[PDB]
Amino acid sequence: SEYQSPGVYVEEVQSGSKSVEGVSTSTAGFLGQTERGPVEPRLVTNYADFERLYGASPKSSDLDAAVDGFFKNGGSRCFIGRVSGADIDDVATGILADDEGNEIAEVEANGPGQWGESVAVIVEDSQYPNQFDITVRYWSGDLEAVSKPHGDRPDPSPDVEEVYDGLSADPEASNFYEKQLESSVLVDIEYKDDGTPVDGLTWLHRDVTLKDYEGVNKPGLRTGLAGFKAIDEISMVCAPDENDIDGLTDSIVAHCENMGDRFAILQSPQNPGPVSEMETPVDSSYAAYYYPWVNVLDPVTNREKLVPPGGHIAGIYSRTDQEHGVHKAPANETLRGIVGLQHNITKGEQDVLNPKGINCIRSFQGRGIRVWGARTTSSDPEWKYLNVRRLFLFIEQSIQEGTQWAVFEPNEQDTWGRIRQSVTNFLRTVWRNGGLQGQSEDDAFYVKCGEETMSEDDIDNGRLIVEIGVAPVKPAEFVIFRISQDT
Amino acid sequence: DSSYAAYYYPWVNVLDPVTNREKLVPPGGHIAGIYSRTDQEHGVHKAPANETLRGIVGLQHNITKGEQDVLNPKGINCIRSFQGRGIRVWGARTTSSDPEWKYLNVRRLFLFIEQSIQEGTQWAVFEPNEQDTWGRIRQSVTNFLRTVWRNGGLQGQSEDDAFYVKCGEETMSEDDIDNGRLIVEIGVAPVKPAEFVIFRISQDT
Amino acid sequence: VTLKDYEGVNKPGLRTGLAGFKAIDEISMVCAPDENDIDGLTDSIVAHCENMGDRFAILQSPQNPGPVSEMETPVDSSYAAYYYPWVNVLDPVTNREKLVPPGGHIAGIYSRTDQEHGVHKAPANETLRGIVGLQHNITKGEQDVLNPKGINCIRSFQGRGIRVWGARTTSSDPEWKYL
Amino acid sequence: SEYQSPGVYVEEVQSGSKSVEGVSTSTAGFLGQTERGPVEPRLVTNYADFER
Amino acid sequence: QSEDDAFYVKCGEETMSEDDIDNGRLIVEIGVAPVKPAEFVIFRISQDT
Amino acid sequence: NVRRLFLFIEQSIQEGTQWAVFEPNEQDTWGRIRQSVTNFLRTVWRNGGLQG
């Protein structure tokens, strides 16, 4: 500071260490087809939210089953992205009119597709002066059989119902209908002119490939994977129908490798061929591969049905992360929400599959159905185990996001000590929770920043270099007992 | 291509107090205010970057990380907007091509030091050119530079690493004394900013 | 009214708006209930509090802030706090419910906590008096996304009532994370 | 790596040793005539599999 | 648990030099340790001992 | 058994060292390779396969 006139001065100084906070690690992302809903990614925390916002899947998709398996196994949060074969602007619309026939508002469905042709909007008048009520109804089945869509009890009870009571036409009020109808899973309203609508009912009229899974990337609209790559909470991605669309596995693995902060879960085909000839599709350290398919009860036929196991496995990942940590291998855990498997694998066949990076789901007598295998598809010996990759992702993202205060700071010993202290505190916390291995701190990790890592050419060019060394913990895959008679 | 100038980009948006609408203006005065604030709360040796802009609504364009890799090595300073952090100045270089005056705070520190020395030494003109005056001048300049060092402006774990001052028979010869010249030599080591923060992480030990 | 009326007059013998407030040394927190109807007022309030250096700013979200996965705080100051959502009250001219921002109730909670506990006590896990209900009910899954972003929530627990659940600032500096 | 714009960089380094794993050593191959079956080689882990 | 853990105050010849005295500066250095809230209350329960 | 042991060792080495192709030909790679092969052979020695 500068002191030019007499007085009292109070100044604040920076302290000797700054805390780092860990990031989320149990959020998932799903892609696939639905019947209703928007095409921008939305967060879901429960299965009833999913049924309310999106509905069911068509016969060519198995998204509903995968989300159900995710939440039955202890998952916490999903990001849903809806993929649609229709143009984004193929949306049903409508108009509201005033006393003498002026269009005052414009109603639009909340997503593209033919479903918007089955939405009815009903306007009625309220008992209080200058107020009216609005109702929105949606039927999932045939419209030809709906007898009284306007009455208090239609012939088939509607699938979705929404009512808004205290509405007004004053734009500066808090009960203006544009502000109240904004939280609605069915429609959108836009204001045009001054007036209040007349009573009655009205319907909305005039309504996949690899490039749809890739998504749209425009200045104000993102779908598909382009929409996911602008969300920083997702830590694992899955596409249940990845084997019906050629060229999607590589796109998913490339997305995860280019972001550098997420993991890919892959499932085998329904018919992968002979056992002696199976291989993994990719050779990435950012993916894992599971086998075989599973059996579930179908809620529209009440019969068994064969589905891929991806969502159940993502739910197992989330559960293990919540109750043990990211350093725990998500294997030797039970699958909930299924009836049986496609095949039963023996111990002789897994001796051929396990050294190849293929993870198996097996069933033991007296113990149930469990995941038996925790490897990645990688050939590098340094990234053979899955929990090591997940721990490194967690650590690296925490460091990246929690150190932006240090840019443009003086390149001298105070900043060096501060940075060293922060990183040491974070790594000691990780060590205390069982993630690092060693009976002392010197065995588990080290951090270096000073004149041993930086030279003078570095200081003259603006570079601050920190070197960190760590020792992760690995699972026990073979438990061996050697018993003898001696001593 | 001067060492006495800095160059900022792009324009900003403000509310106009006669129309109550947005309006696009150059960012010069906001940046000068940031300079003044940083000088008041940190010192002249602190780079006036990674600081927030107050009093605006938005920018003209949003610059990405790929475009700044082309602009930054050219001496052009950018104003960017980060999600979760706001609008900030990201760059602290001069328009100069000389490698000795690449950073802005070094030039500002030298301006400060040189003007202080120029204005606070006029008592020494026409004084006797002998050892007493030499010791007096040396002592004064050493006190000033040690004060600058203690406040974080100079770099080194000891005084010998940060600066030196010389005045005597090693700087002056006899032809100098006969012609009325008193020569003082000063050497200094300024501190520079941390522009790239690098973390190299491995699995060994 | 405009932004220049909220800024106030600054003449030798007349001060209104914020120019009038900056000559009073008792004020310790400032709030403007209608800050979302006048564009450019949030920044002016945060700048006033940062330039005086002795007061704190309380901010409320809009009535329609968008999807949950896209919310952010308006500023990145250590001199401000951000609360969400709106509340319901009885209107004394119609005797009906009405939706209002929660700023004044929260300032009253600040004052109460300061009187009965001290300035070192976090003004959270405290009850809101004088309301009827909230705008939305926030779950535990949605606050896991909002809390690490500096957004403070007002929630309702069964058996315990309506309470403020969160005590952070809008700041990104790790040294000024808590209020 | 190359550093052209200011920010934070995180980089991974290769470690000082890489593990080697032993290969299988107790699998056999048989050739001869049968009454049924395919003519591509198939893996068998039990005699009932062979008869089937 | 003690005063040395909570704060310190310094003013003397460790904070001021002679160039400071000659220019009219009096420097006081204060260090403090504030208390922070309990946001996560965690109970780890086991069967051992 | 000598022939069978050599078959085992040579195939393990062949299949578990493909990361080293096109790497820099300098002291770091040398130390890394030496360390890996020494660990494998010490494991073989501890199980009674080598003599000394």
Author numbering:
A (entry chain G): 2 to 208, 292 to 571
B (entry chain A): 367 to 571
C (entry chain M): 292 to 470
D (entry chain B): 2 to 53
E (entry chain M): 523 to 571
F (entry chain B): 471 to 522
What text does the study give?
Next, we tested for the expression of cis genes by performing crude purifications of CISs from Hb cultures. Mass spectrometry analysis of these preparations detected the presence of Hb protein Cis2 (Hbor_38820), but no other CIS gene cluster components were identified. Using single-particle cryo-EM and helical reconstruction, we obtained a 2.9-Å resolution structure and confirmed that the sheath is composed of Cis2. Except for the flexible region between domains 2 and 3 (residues 209 to 291), all residues could be built into the final atomic model. Within the sheath monomer, three domains are observable, with only a section between domains 2 and 3 being unresolved due to flexibility (residues 209 to 291). In contrast, domains 1 and 2, which face the inside of the assembled sheath and facilitate the contractile mechanism, show a low root mean square deviation (RMSD) of around 1.0 to 1.7 Å. The Cis2 homolog from S. coelicolor showed the highest structural similarity for both the entire structure (4.1-Å RMSD) and only domains 1 and 2 (0.8 Å-RMSD). Contracted sheaths were observed as either free-floating or perpendicular to the cytoplasmic membrane. Our second major finding was that Hb disrupts proliferation and induces cell lysis of Hv in a contact-dependent and T6SS-dependent manner.
Here, we report on the structure and function of haloarchaeal contractile injection systems (CISs). CISs have adapted to a range of functions, but their conserved core is composed of a sheath-tube module (also called a contractile tail), which assembles onto a baseplate. To facilitate toxin secretion, the baseplate triggers contraction of a dynamic outer sheath forcing a rigid inner tube, tipped with a spike protein, to be driven through membranes. Our first major insight was that the CIS gene cluster in Hb has a T6SS mode of action, i.e., it functions while bound to the cytoplasmic membrane.
